[model samples]
Target: QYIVARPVYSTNAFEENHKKTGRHHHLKVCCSCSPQKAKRIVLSLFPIASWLPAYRLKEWLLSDIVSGISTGIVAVLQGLAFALLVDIPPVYGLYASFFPAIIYLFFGTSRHISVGPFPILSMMVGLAVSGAVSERVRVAAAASVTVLSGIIQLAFGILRIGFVVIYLSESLISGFTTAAAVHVLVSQLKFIFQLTVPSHTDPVSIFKVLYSVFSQIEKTNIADLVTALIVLLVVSIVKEINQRFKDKLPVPIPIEFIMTVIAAGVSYGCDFKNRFKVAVVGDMNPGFQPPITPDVETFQNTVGDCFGIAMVAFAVAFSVASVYSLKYDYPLDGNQELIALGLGNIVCGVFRGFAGSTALSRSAVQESTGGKTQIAGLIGAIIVLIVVLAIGFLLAPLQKSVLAALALGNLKGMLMQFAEIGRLWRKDKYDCLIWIMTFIFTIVLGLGLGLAASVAFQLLTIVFRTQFPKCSTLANIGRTNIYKNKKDYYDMYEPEGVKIFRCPSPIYFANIGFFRRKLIDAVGFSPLRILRKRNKALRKIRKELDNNQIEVLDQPINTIDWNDDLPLNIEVPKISLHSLILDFSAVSFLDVSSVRGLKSILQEFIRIKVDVYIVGTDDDFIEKLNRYEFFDGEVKSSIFFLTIHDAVLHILM
Candidate 1:
């Protein structure tokens, strides 16, 4: 039965065959291949082949198509906003929107993420190109920024720097995003109000526009303002209604965004083309042409400025992806995302596009729309292409004012999360500091500098806190063993008992001082004991102790005996039979300071005249301890053991 193969014809025949084959044949089956071959196979299979073939074109089409269309639509509004705000032509905006989305469709792994021209990227370009650059050069810089951002992203992907996004905590990200959203709203005021202001300037430099708006207040078109206000109010109300009735809404699609888009269309339809003869997205020239690669001069100038936008873009993408990955119990590869975004941008730049990054709103739309793969993006692209070529003239009557209103609607939605600032402030003051700091920095310096400063400060605070981790000495109650800080050990008695305490974290330079001080303080009890038992005969026999005595006594404590039957051995003058055995099970790592400190503690125990033993020394710890000469004597003396139980048994022995 064990041999199988028709019972190997007979047991006797199987025995005969096994004997003929020898143990080598059986061993070969169990071991499989040679070690060298096994190593090569393992190395080859670790990363690539495990998940590469999961791709399904059908699923991709479904998902990408929806994501692509939603993203394309959002890109249109975002690009138009930036163009009008910065006084650029509509063509550049359309160029920004088109190529980036197409590039992302191929490279991005997230079915829901849509990469295209974003307000953040547009602002970054606007700022970078404001000084000493001709119009053509500035346009070139926009395309160059895309290439530069792609290169940076590619570098980050290669280095796997995706984990670096952890520095931007949730509170900080929300705070910064909220502040930036407000800035976005403010920047669009000129478009909404039809104010005559310099277009190519920072938001802070828009004071002249404000003055001009006040001076020309009478020229404000009541009809246009009414239309813009109506669009904003309707969009906001629909969004709020959708959120309020989200559970009741039966459809899988994001009814809020879809409703907002419809509302914009209706407003444009009813106002400009129908009744009041209002202005719309004027002179529509929509169609795709061959992509033009950005030149080197523009790439160099814009790349440096794109640093901030890149940081925020990466952070947002990772944040959204990580959250969904966790929610859905899926694996997230940050490096993969970086690669996806990088390749997407490179392709976009090649297609004569501006820089693009992940859009959270568009991603949300894809999710709510039931998109299943990247194919949705392709379908969306098809739709965009059709709109560009065939129906471009039909959308000519679409009002820019309505588009600004739609943008305002989006900005308003983002800004609503601002209430979290107060909530976080009330919940934790430290978190409030981080939130405020990130918000301020993002506004004052820029995204890149702000992110760097915020992350650096957060880590610095953590390191500083760790440098002074609280150290405590363990104590035993009548029936329970408990660790109590020195300050809390009021009724504690050392009399003749040895106090054993365990440190949890690794002993490094940062806490070496703390380690030494705490260990000394734990042993510092001897003086009080000497004073209390001064009249006892055993105490009188011991020599008087001083600071120098304490110092000399500290040496043996540092010598941890790894090889002996006991890890520690010492004597306390006034103590009778009390001994201490420290359990090192909780200690995962030990270093030179720990070893030296153990030796010093051992020497102190000898001076104090108390027997001591160390237990639970793992193989790695033992090897490290035995590497030093101080442990040589202990090893030869057989004082150390592998288990606490073994140490206790030896003490009894």
Candidate 2:
């Protein structure tokens, strides 16, 4: 009669309640069909989509116009100069100057960077094709390299490989660029002195160029020399004045532009080319070339050189862009930059232009002159277009020596970085070594081989760092569980019967033996020394018993005498180490070799009758040790502990 009512539950109660009221179905749609997807694609391809819609003409247009005109003038001047560096006609420099900037405006992520002819890239191109190709095919070769470099950069962007530049360390890059600046300065000596020495591409090209310049000093054009000295002094003084009064001035005066106009007018009026034989840019054609395909034969021959060009172009451009982006507190997409630069170079090559990158000095001028967006680059491109169409004939009389001065003037900041050697030496000697080695190789070998060697040396330093890492004995600080290096922490103390050692680097094949030796040394338990001491103690014990004195246990026996005439009644003293605890808090990983080395260390301690304990090792390492047979059944039970304090306490107990 007293039957307990069992609580009956329906298993399908929740599902039945939550059943679909109707035949619910989801739409079979792809994300690609959405309007947002289309918009994102457009914005990604053309960065102008994001900035153009928010343009404010009233606030930003005037600054953009002024900055564009100013930057255009500087670009035109540099373009003309760098063209000669690439061993191409000066007009091509103008083509390189404007077209790349126009293309970059549409694709570039950085609004402040002014894409144009850079001395480094131009010099690299010149070196690659200098003696290898005929003058008829040199222009074609330059364009082909430009196109190939663009293709390489574009491929890198698509593959998200912008991180490759990380291997080119800052120290190496600075040192390399400084050496390049020296090369540029030396190359310009031919123009400054108006000498006619043949170009040299040897390892000691800088020295050779200097010797050539000095040998032909008597043939130096007086007019060109005077012009270079005057231009150098004028540009230097004007730049100093502008820097001192930069904040006070509305915009820094375009001293280079003003000087260019003055030099051109004076030369044109005086007929310096005819009277003084000063080298001038000479006559340039008035129109742009039709798009031409890069020569496939040249491309195939120069692929290696093209890769170097691509790397240098991206590295230099990214460095400049990153600096400006950081200063203005804006995000910069490095992958997008690679694509932009790649496309810019491709576009320039199509128009018969040479390789190009973002000029740091020109970009600085653009940013300082209130350039807020890519619109400024567009305006600058337009200004250069006008010069190419209307005023191309006017600059024919500009002295080549003036151009050389302009190139040297632009490089003053780069050359000053030689002082970086001293700064790096004081901060980190390894970095100093990298800088010095990079500089030496760059000057002693060609740029391509030098760069490869520098990267290899840098990687070697990484291996050296891990292989010879510092190892130390640790002591407990006060009564706390905290342990630190005994040599570094003054308040630390060694526990009476316990020895602790620490290795701050990961345990690996590279340093496994060193780790073992250092640990054994720290514990003062060398096997040979211990065996010798034990035999000596046995000899003494026998000697004492044989001397006819009362066999006293109070006087400790130093030796156990084992002579043939001695009785076997004397007890030999045994020496044994009590406990050793290894602190592995800093050890992040262990390799198979390291685990084997650990087994060997454990066996040695076992033979010495020393109880070994491990502390601060994670489960992964413990499992690895077990898998490697480091702990057999007989010694596995209590070998691992959670902390140094726990291990010490367990040993004491």
Candidate 3:
């Protein structure tokens, strides 16, 4: 006979039972290893190293290279745009295209998620580091943010806490994103208006800048502003035109995005040598080198700011990861993604780049271009490096107005998604509020404060909902059954006053107070009697009674009496008390806490002399109710019946 290997434990009842049952087995020989070595062995189970050997040389040359080139071109353009958004030197953007991608190829579960510098993350980094330090200090702070964020993410993944990303709901995300896009677009208005706004100023400063521009309207550079507007107009038209052809195209290539970029090149080329008179990227450092060691005293001084920035980075990265996973219908291992990103930041800190996340646009491009692994990202990085080396001399004469136009163009395209907000608003008004709040907070306060306030708003909404969950009576309508609020059942009348309500969600601590309020409301309403109004013939009796001329002694004083043995001739025009018979058949499950709450409600019913019958209760629910013993002996006195019809019949009888 086979014996089970079970150990005896003081806390375990199963062990005691096993010992009595005589099913214990002898122990087998055990092997041991050092804790450090055991940890190393366990770490190897992640299986990241195996994918490298699986990489094929032929596959690399054909598929990877083609994908790499396509990705590289887009990365070069987008990387520069991101750098411009944050006002970082252009070379930092170039460096951002490299290490993150390479690290992600090893750790990332998804083939399509491109780990690189992105506009959204760049904006977040800008918001995180802008006010706390000087321009030179900001770069180091940016790098520090990346490193700190990576460490936090790695720890989360190591602890298997990656599942927390689900807290950011899709509706809220879409709405906030649309609003944020508008914010980004609004930031570019200075470029569009040719307003000489000071760097790192708030949005309200736009009005000031516009005022200054009007004061020196001669310096607005009429040709440059007109050129920018023309570029914006053409890009806008092409995007709209592409929407008409979107379905007809074989694949959903973002033709609009590409066209907008092309417009950027054209706008710059049109101005040519004269463009130098406008603003530009000017001279830039173009090499792969580590950032200077962060001043520890300075970092310590800015710990609060660094922590806040790191949190924003974490949110952005997690959001991007989940979005891509959901869109692609693939499992996302967020912990591993964290590992990849953390390692990416460590590399960035070494190579003088700032914080970043999975770039949605680049990731989409990589996926569409048939990128199989992170090698495509490595190739994109190489291209960025080359551009950085060349940009210093090659782009010196490049018009700042043209770059400004490019930024403005991105803003316009991004802002176009606000139409989606209307769709969500129609579906659920509360979610629209969530989005609006996030937008207002971001715009009115700052990114960190906005994010905090939004999170708080969502939590409060959750608490409020739990405090007043929808409760109603369920009734059968031929073959189907549905819940209706008790007070709303006036549409249909039954011979006997039998009411059934369905408690939609679990009764919990938050909603227990609502139960009391509902009961009180029901009792406040007067019950209907048979003699609602005196007939014309009985007007004399009513007048005589009013004048105290006649003494009427046959009137019943008590509303309810249970002493009579005769069949109860209850002439109930309407049941006045909210003594509802709840149908528990629809309730699939109930917790101990809710069962306790029900007992408290039952006691309240007893005190008010109200009878509450529970009908259509399943065996499982009955068992749970029975466990409390709160309803054991006393329940049958006030509660009875298997169905609503039976309960009504008992009342009428």
Candidate 4:
């Protein structure tokens, strides 16, 4: 039995049945309306959804607990010190430390990153609030800035523009951080020396601080100075010991927290506040405050500062997140990170906290202590909560000078970025210039102006490089057809009656004119010189033929035809080029302007009776050329070849 080739049912009947069923058929299989879509959307919005359900209690519980405690201790210490930088109540630092970590635990992708009060962000908050008339106004302004910054970050996340940080560049980041570290050091000098200085928000604030410190040199408190130096020395020494013996030790010691405790103890024991007139942190209210909306009135005034803060916070956090994500071999979503950070800041701002970011030191500590998940951050938040609710009064006697020392100690790593200048100089001069100029502008005009100028300069360099690209004349080495730069390889030979030109960049509007000029010159076609030589050669050839003394050409050189009626003084160069091979291996693409320019050049070559052949162009470029009708029937038949060897062989044949 043979199978039938035709359908058994009538075609109209099948079509009628298909039409009846097709209307609702897609509902059963459509992925957009599937249950899994909702799950995926939820998981994408909240990263914790993916990891929380599979939480490893038996293997990671103990490690997370331990790491969380260590991170919490460091967080509390940093929170207090950084709060002072923002000129906020010290208790707000504890709020900042506890709340952001809680929000980040649910939204953040990285398990190792510890979100909290960071020195740089705090310093920016301080700058934003410095102009406010009263403490209440300042606090409101800082909170408004925090909320605005969060809004900006969240907007970027929603727009999936997390790659904005990439535009900042490594050189710019290093330079900005180094300059900021210097600013922090200068700003802390008053606390270190107990000198009263007028606040300045100008770019030259550092110089003003220095001048004020010197003018009030006699008013400097000896006790505060001594206390600061001792704290700085101890922190530096302990950090060095921890780094040097990190492998031998089970965990790197929490020197910063220990130093803070020691300073508090010493301040209490010596009665420094009353005896030596040294400033103390003073009493702080226990427990958390009710959440409050940021003041709308302050929003308009701090919009610019918010943008600056948002960029800096995201850059710092994303940088830390990227480093650890690579080290641990984990995938990170940059946009999700932005959302997490934005949510963290928003939550902190609601709870009466200042601006905050991912603290690099605390995150490092969390990772080093074997943090396995965001559980560690959650645990850290819980620990800080306990401190806020119960023993907040214990830190009241801490000296302001000690806080300054702590701030300065945290900056040691950032200040070391100055060393990058030397490395960049040795590796790339342009990169070095970027670093130097960014640092100078940041120091002289502040971060916003400096960053904008640096990126603009970098973009300009890119344009400059493309506008004046290098064009070379290639020559064959021996009989191998191995082409190299004619100027670079002295032993290379230029084949007779053929010129090879190589353009190393794409032909575009920026360099079309330059490309044409360079190609013409390479083929020995200088306008004025060629015209003068043509007139002289035509006169000589005409006179010699008239005198019956032409010995140069046995057959009158069939390539050039001379007419008896041709003017004796006419400028007509004896064209040497028989064929020109343009090697386009380096030209990946061509624009319309370049296509037109190529057409003009080819027309000129055709007028001179010199053939123009293009080699090393892919099928796509040929299609584009054909689309533009760059070559007519006569030209297209003999103008394009796969390689220089094929073109040369064709010319010879």
What lDDT does candidate 3 reach at residue 340?
69
Highest-scoring model, lDDT = 2
**Candidate order (TM-score):** 4, 2, 3, 1
Residue 94, candidate 1: alpha-carbon lDDT: 65
lDDT of 1 by residue, 51-102 (tens): 3467666655555555656655655566666666445565566665566566
Candidate 3, residues 126-242, lDDT tens digits: the string is 765655464566667777666665666677667867676566666556655666675566555555555665555434433443455567655566656776776667755665564
lDDT of 4 by residue, 407-462 (tens): 78777789888888669888887778878888888777765556667777877655
**Candidate 4: regions farther than 4 A off:** 1-31, 131-134, 526-567, 592-600, 619-640
Candidate 3: worst-modelled 10 consecutive residues by lDDT: 528-537
Model 2 agreement with the true structure over 1-653: per-residue lDDT tens digits: 54535222121232355574565432555434787777776788678788889999899999999999889888888888898887777888988988888888888889898889888887788887763473447777788788888999999998888888778888988989998888888888878888887767746667877888899788877888888999999998898888789788988878998898899899877889778787788788888888888777777667777788888998898888888888889888888888988898898988889889888889989999999998889888887898899988788888988888988888878988989867987898888888999999988787766787788898877667788778888888887667778898787878776888788899888889888778877777574444444444555655534444433322333432222333545343344457788878888888788887877677656545578777787656665665667667546636776777777766766
Q: Which stretches of candidate 1 lie over 4 Å from their true place?
A: 1-75, 82-87, 131-134, 159-162, 196-224, 247-280, 301-303, 326-332, 419-429, 479-497, 502-506, 525-653
lDDT of 3: 0.58
**Alpha carbon lDDT of each predicted model:** 0.60, 0.79, 0.58, 0.77
Clashing pairs in 4: none
True-structure lDDT of candidate 2: 0.79
The ten-residue window of minimal lDDT in model 1 covers 558-567
